[PDB]
Amino acid sequence: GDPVAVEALLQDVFGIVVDEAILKGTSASEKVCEWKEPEELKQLLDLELQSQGESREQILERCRTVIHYSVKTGHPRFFNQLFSGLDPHALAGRIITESLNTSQYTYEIAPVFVLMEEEVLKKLRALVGWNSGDGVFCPGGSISNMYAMNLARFQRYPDCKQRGLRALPPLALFTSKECHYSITKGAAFLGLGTDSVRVVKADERGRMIPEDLERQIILAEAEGSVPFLVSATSGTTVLGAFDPLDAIADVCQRHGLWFHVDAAWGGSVLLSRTHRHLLDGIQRADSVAWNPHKLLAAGLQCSALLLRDTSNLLKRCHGSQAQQDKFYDVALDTGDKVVQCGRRVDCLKLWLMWKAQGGQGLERRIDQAFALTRYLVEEIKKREGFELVMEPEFVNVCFWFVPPSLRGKKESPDYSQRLSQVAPVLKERMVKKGTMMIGYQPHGTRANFFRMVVANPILAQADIDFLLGELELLGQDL
Amino acid sequence: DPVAVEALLQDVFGIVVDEAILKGTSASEKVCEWKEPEELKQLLDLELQSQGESREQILERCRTVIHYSVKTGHPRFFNQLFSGLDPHALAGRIITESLNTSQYTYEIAPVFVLMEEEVLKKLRALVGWNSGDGVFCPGGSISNMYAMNLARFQRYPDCKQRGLRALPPLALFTSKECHYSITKGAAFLGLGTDSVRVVKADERGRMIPEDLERQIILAEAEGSVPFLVSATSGTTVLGAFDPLDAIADVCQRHGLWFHVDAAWGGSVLLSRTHRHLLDGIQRADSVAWNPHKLLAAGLQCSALLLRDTSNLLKRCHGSQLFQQDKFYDVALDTGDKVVQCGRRVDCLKLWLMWKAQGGQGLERRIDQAFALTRYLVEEIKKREGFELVMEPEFVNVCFWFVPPSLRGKKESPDYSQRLSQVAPVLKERMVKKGTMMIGYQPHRANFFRMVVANPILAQADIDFLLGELELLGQDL
Numbered sequence: 007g008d009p010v011a012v013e014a015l016l017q018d019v020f021g022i023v024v025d026e027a028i029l030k031g032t033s034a035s036e037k038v039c040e041w042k043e044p045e046e047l048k049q050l051l052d053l054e055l056q057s058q059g060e061s062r063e064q065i066l067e068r069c070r071t072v073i074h075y076s077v078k079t080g081h082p083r084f085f086n087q088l089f090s091g092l093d094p095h096a097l098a099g100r101i102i103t104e105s106l107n108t109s110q111y112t113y114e115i116a117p118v119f120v121l122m123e124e125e126v127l128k129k130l131r132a133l134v135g136w137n138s139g140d141g142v143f144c145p146g147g148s149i150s151n152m153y154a155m156n157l158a159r160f161q162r163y164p165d166c167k168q169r170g171l172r173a174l175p176p177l178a179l180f181t182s183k184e185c186h187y188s189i190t191k192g193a194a195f196l197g198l199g200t201d202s203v204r205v206v207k208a209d210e211r212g213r214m215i216p217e218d219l220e221r222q223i224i225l226a227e228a229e230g231s232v233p234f235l236v237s238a239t240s241g242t243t244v245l246g247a248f249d250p251l252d253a254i255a256d257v258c259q260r261h262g263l264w265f266h267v268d269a270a271w272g273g274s275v276l277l278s279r280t281h282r283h284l285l286d287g288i289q290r291a292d293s294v295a296w297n298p299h300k301l302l303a304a305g306l307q308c309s310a311l312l313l314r315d316t317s318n319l320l321k322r323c324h325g326s327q328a329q330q331d332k333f334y335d336v337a338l339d340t341g342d343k344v345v346q347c348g349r350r351v352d353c354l355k356l357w358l359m360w361k362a363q364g365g366q367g368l369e370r371r372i373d374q375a376f377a378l379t380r381y382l383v384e385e386i387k388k389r390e391g392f393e394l395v396m397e398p399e400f401v402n403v404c405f406w407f408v409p410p411s412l413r414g415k416k417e418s419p420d421y422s423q424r425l426s427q428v429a430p431v432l433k434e435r436m437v438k439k440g441t442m443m444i445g446y447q448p449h450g451t452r453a454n455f456f457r458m459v460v461a462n463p464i465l466a467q468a469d470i471d472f473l474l475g476e477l478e479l480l481g482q483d484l
Numbered sequence: 485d486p487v488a489v490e491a492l493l494q495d496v497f498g499i500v501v502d503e504a505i506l507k508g509t510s511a512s513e514k515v516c517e518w519k520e521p522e523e524l525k526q527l528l529d530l531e532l533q534s535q536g537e538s539r540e541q542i543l544e545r546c547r548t549v550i551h552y553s554v555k556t557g558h559p560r561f562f563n564q565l566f567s568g569l570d571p572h573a574l575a576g577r578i579i580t581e582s583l584n585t586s587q588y589t590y591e592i593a594p595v596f597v598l599m600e601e602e603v604l605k606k607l608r609a610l611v612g613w614n615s616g617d618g619v620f621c622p623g624g625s626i627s628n629m630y631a632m633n634l635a636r637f638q639r640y641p642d643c644k645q646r647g648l649r650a651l652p653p654l655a656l657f658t659s660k661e662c663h664y665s666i667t668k669g670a671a672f673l674g675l676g677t678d679s680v681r682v683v684k685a686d687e688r689g690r691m692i693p694e695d696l697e698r699q700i701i702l703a704e705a706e707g708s709v710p711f712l713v714s715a716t717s718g719t720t721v722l723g724a725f726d727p728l729d730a731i732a733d734v735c736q737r738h739g740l741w742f743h744v745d746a747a748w749g750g751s752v753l754l755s756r757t758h759r760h761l762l763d764g765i766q767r768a769d770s771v772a773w774n775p776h777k778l779l780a781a782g783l784q785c786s787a788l789l790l791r792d793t794s795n796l797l798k799r800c801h802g803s804q805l806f807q808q809d810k811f812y813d814v815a816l817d818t819g820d821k822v823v824q825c826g827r828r829v830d831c832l833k834l835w836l837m838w839k840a841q842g843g844q845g846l847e848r849r850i851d852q853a854f855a856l857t858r859y860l861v862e863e864i865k866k867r868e869g870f871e872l873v874m875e876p877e878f879v880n881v882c883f884w885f886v887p888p889s890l891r892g893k894k895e896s897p898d899y900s901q902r903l904s905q906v907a908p909v910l911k912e913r914m915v916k917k918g919t920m921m922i923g924y925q926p927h928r929a930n931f932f933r934m935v936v937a938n939p940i941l942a943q944a945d946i947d948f949l950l951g952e953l954e955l956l957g958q959d960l
């Protein structure tokens with residue numbers, strides 16, 4: 007109240023959103039970003055909060071400004087991250103979620119979503135290969151990884167929950183040198199310390215070497231630490247590599263270790279009958295992290311933690327020593343499953359898109375991203391100046407743009423240094439033009455290279471031809 | 485293609501406006517649509533399938549999901565520490581979701597990096613600080629864990645690398661009335677729950693400084709290292725406010741990090757009239773404050789504020805050959821401040837509402853909630869069958885409904901056990917009828933915890949809810 011005013015405000019806001027954020031925001035005819043230096047953007051935004059409010063017209067103008075100067079992450083030429091694109095059904099679900107404004111904490115205040123989340127989690131477990139189990143959604147896959155670490159410690163040393171880490175021996179966990187940095191950040195957060203993380207060599211394709219895993223386990227034991235968890239990666243953030251899960255599982259079983267699979271990125275490939283062999287062996291995991299907000303475009307945040315456990319380990323680990331006077335089955339309440347209290351609804355946006363697309367529609371999208379990745383690799387191999395870092399296993403395509411001044415100069419002593427300066431210059435230019443955005447980074451001894459990501463559901467070959475031609479134009483003088 | 489997307493989303497928004505926003509804030513509609521779980525399971529037809537569905541089937545699912553969800557903006561929704569729908573905050577939420585980015589780098593969120601900075605700058609200003617640091621968190625429970633982690637790292641930075649076995653045993657202190665995230669957090673961080681020393685609270689639900697200082701001296705005598713005190717400004721059950729100036733005096737004498745869990749009560753800082761409740765907060769090292777509670781910003785909107793200006797936050801949470809020579813000043817990026825990687829934008833919804841209302845409009849709302857709390861107290865005291873648990877100092881009003889069968893029977897030896905059965909029955913009846921939702925809490929006999937927070941609340945709703953408890957409890 008006033009409801010007329012409320013409806014008119016929201017419809018007028020929503021009109022700006024549809025026109026400026028959704029239509030213009032996903033159009034190749036518009037810019038991916040409107041670069042402004044920080045200090046200049048602050049002036050343009052006029053951010054200082056004040057005692058006096060503003061008019062309806064001033065507010066709507068501010069809505070336009072925020073949109074105008076924001077990055078268009080649904081644009082066909084946005085390649086900067088491991089998510090890209092705007093699924094309309096997911097967005098409808100997001101909008102519904104934000105209007106209902108509840109906490110996913112008890113059946114009492116979130117009955118539709120408590121049941122919806124169970125069912126989504128059940129289907130995700132099925133695609134992993136489990137007909138039973140547990141799990142919960144988390145605010146980001148980094149938190150999912152920490153849940154797994156905490157559960158592994160609890161399962162082996164449940165006295166830790168009450169007595170803390172001084173009642174325990176030193177603990178060691180194991181992960182690939184290509185691991186997401188949430189493993190070490192989590193270890194530090196959980197009190198283990200980053201030193202508890204034993205890094206395992208990866209092979210030329212970026213995949214953990216099971217033989218170096220075993221060596222590392224034995225060495226950690228000889229040094230007086232107690233191995234308790236192995237974390238493999240099914241889809242590394244840079245190369246997009248997939249650890250060999252059946253062989254890592256073998257090492258875990260021989261040593262009695264908890265087997266966690268960080269599939270935040272690659273787990274969505276389980277919807278593709280064609281490409282899900284990349285995760286063969288994942289059904290042997292004790293836990294799996296999986297982020298549908300990446301490859302499936304569900305929207306941040308959409309991160310699930312799946313468990314094979316069927317013994318209420320999740321509630322026993324995180325539940326409060328304190329629901330015995332209610333009129334419904336309290337097993338439906340999920341507060342004891344998490345360290346949060348309030349928790350956003352993150353299942354609707356995925357569930358609604360999934361209902362609209364079908365399993366077939368999402369499989370088709372994944373298969374179309376793998377097919378477009380093949381087109382990008384072919385164009386890179388047929389064009390002068392483009393050099394692949396390694397053959398892609400996923401939708402990460404890593405490559406250099408070799409500018410004319412360096413072609414043939416590989417044997418020169420400063421070739422890797424000179425080449426490392428190319429991507430940063432191209433990034434600045436494409437960003438300041440607004441034509442596209444592509445992530446780049448160095449890697450081991452490798453000079454700065456681009457990491458292209460083929461994921462946007464509306465991507466087309468014409469966009470790959472455009473990005474390659476745009477790099478040639480932007481790097482001609484380098 | 486674009487015409488079908490616009491058509492779809494406009495169709496969906498029509499339903500959202502009709503069912504969620506207009507019906508969901510109408511006193512004539514129910515607050516919840518109770519269904520036994522198994523009936524709702526079957527009604528919803530949740531099972532995911534190979535084939536997709538038509539636009540028509542999808543729009544039906546949108547209306548169904550809204551129909552059966554609780555209307556947390558309804559005037560008679562009192563179940564939580566949040567209630568109501570601010571349309572500007574909602575407008576900000578809807579923009580955020582359509583821009584779908586990560587509050588991570590200026591490069592992919594240039595507007596929101598600068599926006600969060602200003603918002604946090606203002607929040608610190610209301611705490612009483614003209615400098616500092618901070619970040620937004622996915623819930624106040626995590627805000628509290630950050631504070632625990634920061635205090636640990638600030639005293640024992642070797643912990644980040646070597647972990648807790650390289651440290652002495654550690655002790656933190658909170659009130660008996662504190663939020664359970666303190667104890668879940670301690671376990672999560674490897675401290676163990678035994679590290680949390682519970683301090684007695686007084687008759688009004690407030691930490692007793694004398695018992696805090698005692699527990700601190702004891703922990704030392706047992707060989708532990710006291711390192712943190714966590715106070716609460718606005719407890720979840722009684723809405724008490726710990727005496728922050730006296731607690732600060734204690735932390736100061738023993739060199740302890742002083743954290744104020746103001747998730748609930750922090751918003752009172754916007755009120756010149758009522759902010760005295762948080763006197764002494766300016767002396768804290770850290771403050772948790774949830775605008776999604778009393779300011780109605782939308783879940784999640786939970787700030788962690790630090791007086792620190794030395795990048796303690798980045799040293800604590802930061803991830804540590806050829807140089808990635810980004811072309812702008814990466815000091816602007818906030819990825820190292822948090823243990824997440826991806827992070828939602830949560831500042832727009834708050835900022836847009838603040839621009840619309842001004843600090844003056846938000847202060848108006850807070851003062852109006854306090855005044856309506858006085859009204860509710862008055863009506864409880866003037867009505868037969870209602871007994872206040874204690875005098876409220878915030879917007880939480882804790883009270884029993886004594887049904888006719890127990891009026892006068894206080895001295896019976898089993899009066900309490902019979903009184904404690906009343907609220908669970910009234911709760912079941914009000915949920916299944918759908919006219920209102922009020923939480924009750926065991927803490928003596930199960931009492932109700934009313935919460936006066938919804939911005940559209942009026943006297944008529946307080947009259948209604950008292951009348952409704954009488955109706956629902958006349959046969960008890």
Ligand SMILES: [Cl-]
Binds near residue numbers: 087088089
């Ligand atoms: Cl990403």
Ligand SMILES: [Cl-]
Binds near residue numbers: 348350622784
């Ligand atoms: Cl959340």
Ligand SMILES: [Cl-]
Binds near residue numbers: 366534
């Ligand atoms: Cl399916």
Ligand SMILES: [Cl-]
Binds near residue numbers: 348564565566
């Ligand atoms: Cl709450």
Ligand SMILES: [Cl-]
Binds near residue numbers: 145827
């Ligand atoms: Cl988040």
Ligand SMILES: [Cl-]
Binds near residue numbers: 055056842843844
């Ligand atoms: Cl203000």
Ligand SMILES: [Co+2]
Binds near residue numbers: 391
């Ligand atoms: Co080539």
Ligand SMILES: [Co+2]
Binds near residue numbers: 865866868
């Ligand atoms: Co009375």
